Amino acid sequence: EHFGVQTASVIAVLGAAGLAVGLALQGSLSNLAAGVLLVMFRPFRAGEYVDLGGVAGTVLSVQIFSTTMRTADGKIIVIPNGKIIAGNIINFSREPVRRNEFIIGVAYDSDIDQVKQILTNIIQSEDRILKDREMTVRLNELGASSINFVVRVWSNSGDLQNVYWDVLERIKREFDAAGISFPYPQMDVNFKRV
Amino acid sequence: EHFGVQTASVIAVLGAAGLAVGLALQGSLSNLAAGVLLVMFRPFRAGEYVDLGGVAGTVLSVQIFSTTMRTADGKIIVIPNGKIIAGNIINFSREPVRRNEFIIGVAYDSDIDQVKQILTNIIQSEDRILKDREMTVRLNELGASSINFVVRVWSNSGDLQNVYWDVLERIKREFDAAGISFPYPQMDVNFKRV
Ligand SMILES: CCCCCCCCCCCC
Numbered sequence: 050e051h052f053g054v055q056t057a058s059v060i061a062v063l064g065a066a067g068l069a070v071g072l073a074l075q076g077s078l079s080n081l082a083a084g085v086l087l088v089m090f091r092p093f094r095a096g097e098y099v100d101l102g103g104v105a106g107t108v109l110s111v112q113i114f115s116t117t118m119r120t121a122d123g124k125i126i127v128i129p130n131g132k133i134i135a136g137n138i139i140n141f142s143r144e145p146v147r148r149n150e151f152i153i154g155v156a157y158d159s160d161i162d163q164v165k166q167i168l169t170n171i172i173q174s175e176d177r178i179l180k181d182r183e184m185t186v187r188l189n190e191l192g193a194s195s196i197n198f199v200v201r202v203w204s205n206s207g208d209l210q211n212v213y214w215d216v217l218e219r220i221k222r223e224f225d226a227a228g229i230s231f232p233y234p235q236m237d238v239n240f241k242r243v
Numbered sequence: 244e245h246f247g248v249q250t251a252s253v254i255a256v257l258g259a260a261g262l263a264v265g266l267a268l269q270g271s272l273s274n275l276a277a278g279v280l281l282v283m284f285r286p287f288r289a290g291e292y293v294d295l296g297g298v299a300g301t302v303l304s305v306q307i308f309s310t311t312m313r314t315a316d317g318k319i320i321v322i323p324n325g326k327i328i329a330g331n332i333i334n335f336s337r338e339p340v341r342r343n344e345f346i347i348g349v350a351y352d353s354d355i356d357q358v359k360q361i362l363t364n365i366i367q368s369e370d371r372i373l374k375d376r377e378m379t380v381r382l383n384e385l386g387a388s389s390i391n392f393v394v395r396v397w398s399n400s401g402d403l404q405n406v407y408w409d410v411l412e413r414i415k416r417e418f419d420a421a422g423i424s425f426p427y428p429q430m431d432v433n434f435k436r437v
């Protein structure tokens with residue numbers, strides 16, 4: 050507003066260039082805004098295992114335009130912040146306690162009471178399974194070749210996979226020793242010709 | 244702004260032509276901006292194996308409007324930069340260390356302790372498997388006809404496939420010699436007529 054030979058000769062071009070860039074760079078501003086929101090509102094922090102639209106992995110850092118997370122295998126993934134904000138964010142390592150689910154399929158002949166008692170004994174003897182939570186051991190479904198039970202136990206988000214593996218191995222050992230048998234796919238074949 | 248018979252007689256047409264081209268060429272400017280961003284921010288460099296929206300292959304070079312990557316087979320692929328930026332970029336060769344996963348399915352009768360000891364011995368004897376990382380060998384699932392273990396070992400991104408092949412061959416050899424048996428699909432057939 051002071052001189053027309055100092056900025057008008059350059060503003061007439063700078064404004065048009067900026068408008069053209071914004072029109073072409075609209076995605077850039079969208080990503081920048083999404084990143085600013087992600088820094089302000091923290092759905093996930095660095096080092097938190099998250100799943101962003103079917104791409105799960107540990108989050109490394111939220112940058113200006115994209116956030117890079119290292120998956121379990123070890124491959125780096127870069128996701129624009131716009132789609133991260135526009136989609137659902139599943140945070141695996143937010144709640145301190147998570148739940149394990151087992152599906153043990155025993156044969157039909159297997160006694161229900163014995164199986165439930167064995168599963169309850171296995172669940173209780175584990176000190177990493179929170180007792181104040183719900184420990185469910187009940188028959189769930191009558192499968193094609195085996196009735197499968199469901200075991201649900203809550204454990205700290207840290208020692209969850211270890212609890213799962215230990216419980217599964219102990220279940221197999223006890224069932225093998227106790228007498229319960231895991232059945233192979235059973236087929237009933239009938240004959241009509243010698 | 245100096246003469247109306249020098250540029251006005253041509254600007255009135257040049258501006259309209261440029262506007263029409265930009266309207267028709269909007270994708271061209273979008274691709275150019277995406278390419279500029281890819282050169283500035285480097286999610287992937289030339290010679291880095293990447294996966295861009297379900298199209299994996301070594302990246303050759305980022306051009307003005309598209310980047311050509313040569314897949315594993317040897318076929319060249321050209322992808323506009325706009326969709327490259329708008330999508331997720333998985334970088335396989337960014338982290339120096341990556342993880343291998345094995346799924347060995349042994350028969351139910353196979354002893355768990357012997358199988359785990361054999362797998363651990365195989366894992367440790369390999370000098371290309373990083374010891375400071377996590378070497379997981381534990382029973383993972385009770386399959387329909389075979390309990391399958393999971394082996395996870397970290398190795399340098401360079402000698403990863405070679406490690407996988409060597410470990411798999413050694414596993415087969417030891418299991419064949421040790422006594423462990425890989426089971427064929429087992430079916431339990433019952434009879435109700437002679
Ligand atoms: C464009 C509107 C922005 C509104 C910002 C709300 C403030 C959020 C702060 C939350 C702190 C945990």
Ligand SMILES: CCCCCCCCCCCC
Binds near residue numbers: 074283284
């Ligand atoms: C349209 C906004 C462009 C912002 C450019 C940010 C600078 C990035 C430089 C990164 C160097 C590694």
